[PDB]
Amino acid sequence: TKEEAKQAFKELLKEKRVPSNASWEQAMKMIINDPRYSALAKLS
Numbered sequence: 001t002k003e004e005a006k007q008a009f010k011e012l013l014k015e016k017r018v019p020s021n022a023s024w025e026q027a028m029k030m031i032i033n034d035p036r037y038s039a040l041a042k043l044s
Contacts, residue, residue, distance in 0.1 A: 005040075012036075 018027050031037060 008040075 012031055013027070016027075016030060
């Protein structure tokens with residue numbers, strides 16, 4: 001179940017670039033901006 005959602009997160013990070021210079025906080029914001037983020041929250 002929730003296992004599929006976890007996989008999406010890992011795949012999302014791989015799909016998007018995450019420069020070492022950046023930071024986890026910045027990387028998190030990057031995925032949040034993505035419209036997909038809104039859909040993830042709705043999950044319904």
